Amino acid sequence: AQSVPWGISRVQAPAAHNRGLTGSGVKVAVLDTGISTHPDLNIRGGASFVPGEPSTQDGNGHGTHVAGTIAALNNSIGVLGVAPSAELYAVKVLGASGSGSVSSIAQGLEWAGNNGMHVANLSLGSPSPSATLEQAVNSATSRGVLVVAASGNSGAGSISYPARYANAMAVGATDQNNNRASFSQYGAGLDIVAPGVNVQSTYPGSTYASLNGTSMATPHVAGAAALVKQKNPSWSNVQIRNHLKNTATSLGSTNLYGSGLVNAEAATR
Ligand SMILES: [Ca+2]
Ligand SMILES: [Ca+2]
């Protein structure tokens, strides 16, 4: 029995699936705690930049969960990703405690750029600016990677790093009423929002779990970006970013919502 998580429907990913767009041939790096083998996931490869964790498997759960929102397989089990044919790469930059260093994150962004990733999902933050982080972001972006990052779960009216840097697409979280989730950070730099409450996805152990956070919102956008790239293979990171905002459903102040709610139907028309 396959279920479709509410968020996947809300961004209207199955309309895009019906048009034949599933993210096929699009390479997506998940910079997180790793990704575990799972019957509803296909991992094409990856790299670890965590000291003394040479494998890319997930000892936390967060990365596996984020990965399934992007690319859970279309079949008779589990859930369904926004872009269920995307090519998933596990880039481990966070440890089991869900924490890492800017050194690790930057090395991951370097690798993504160097290995031709189209999209880099960064469901993570730093509260404090880091030059190393911003140059890493800038670097990946000039190589052609589209960097998507979580705004943060503190509830404040400013957003975390590296989401706050110009070349990273900043994603906040909405609830089932399409309101801003109380924890979702907002303010200057916010680009767009996506479902981030009660998000069911894949979890280590061959199982499924429901989590809340802007970390859960971000992969909806990463997924939607892979659909736009399959339909428009010559488009740049910047064209995709702009088209997602331009086609999003408007929710009110840009301070709070960015351009609004990502809409995969409208972006693949
Ligand atoms: Ca499935
Ligand atoms: Ca930004």
**Structure resolution, Å:** 1.8
Asked whether 99 and 242 are in contact (CB, 8 A), the reply is no
* Of 99, 93, 174, 76, nearest in space to 136 by CA: 93
d(CA 121, CA 109): 10
CA of 179 to the centre of ligand 1 (A): 28
Q: Where are the beta strands (DSSP E) in the chain?
A: 27-32, 43-48, 87-92, 119-122, 146-150, 169-174, 190-195, 199-203, 207-211
What dihedral angle (degrees, nearest 10) is formed by the CA atoms of 251, 159, 8, 250?
10
d(CA 96, CA 47): 15
H helix runs in 92-196, sequence order: 102-114, 131-143
d(CA 180, CA 152): 12
Strand order in the sheet with 27-32: 43-48, 87-92, 27-32, 119-122, 146-150, 169-174, 190-195
| Pairing status of strand 207-211 against strand 199-203 | antiparallel
d(CA 119, CA 146): 5
For 61, which DSSP code?
A: S
Write out the H or E segment, with its range, that includes residue 239: helix 237-246
Q: Which residues pair with 91 in a beta bridge?
A: 31, 47
Name the burial class of residue 118, with classes exposed (0-12), middle (13-18) and buried (19+) by CB atoms within 10 angstroms of its CB.
buried
CA of 205 to the centre of ligand 2 (A): 34
What's the per-residue H, E or C state across 81-94?
A: CCCCCCEEEEEECC
Which among 85, 151, 184, 215 is annotated as catalytic? 215
What dihedral angle (degrees, nearest 10) is formed by the CA atoms of 72, 73, 74, 77?
-90
Our answer to whether residue 32 is catalytic in this structure is yes
Task: Please enumerate, as own/partner, the contacts of 98-104 that have beta carbons within 8 Å and a separation of 24 or more.
Answer: 98/33, 98/60, 98/62, 100/50, 100/124, 102/126, 102/130, 102/132, 102/133, 103/49, 103/132, 104/49, 104/50, 104/51
Name the burial class of residue 19, with classes exposed (0-12), middle (13-18) and buried (19+) by CB atoms within 10 angstroms of its CB.
middle
Our answer to whether residue 62 is catalytic in this structure is yes
Q: Which residues pair with 195 in a beta bridge?
A: 174
| Pairing status of strand 119-122 against strand 87-92 | unpaired
The ligand minimizing its distance to the Cα of 159 is 2
Q: Distance of alpha carbon 145 from its chain centroid, rounded?
A: 13
Asked whether 2 and 77 are in contact (CB, 8 A), the reply is yes
Q: Which residues pair with 126 in a beta bridge?
A: 161
CA of 183 to the centre of ligand 1 (A): 29
Q: Which residues pair with 174 in a beta bridge?
A: 180, 195
d(CA 258, CA 214): 14
Q: Which residues pair with 122 in a beta bridge?
A: 149
Give, rounded to a whole angstrom, the gap between the first and last alpha carbons of the chain: 29
The ligand minimizing its distance to the Cα of 40 is 1
Our answer to whether residue 184 is catalytic in this structure is no
The ligand minimizing its distance to the Cα of 38 is 1
Q: Enumerate domains of the chain plus CATH numbers.
A: 1-269 (3.40.50.200)
Q: Which residues pair with 202 in a beta bridge?
A: 208
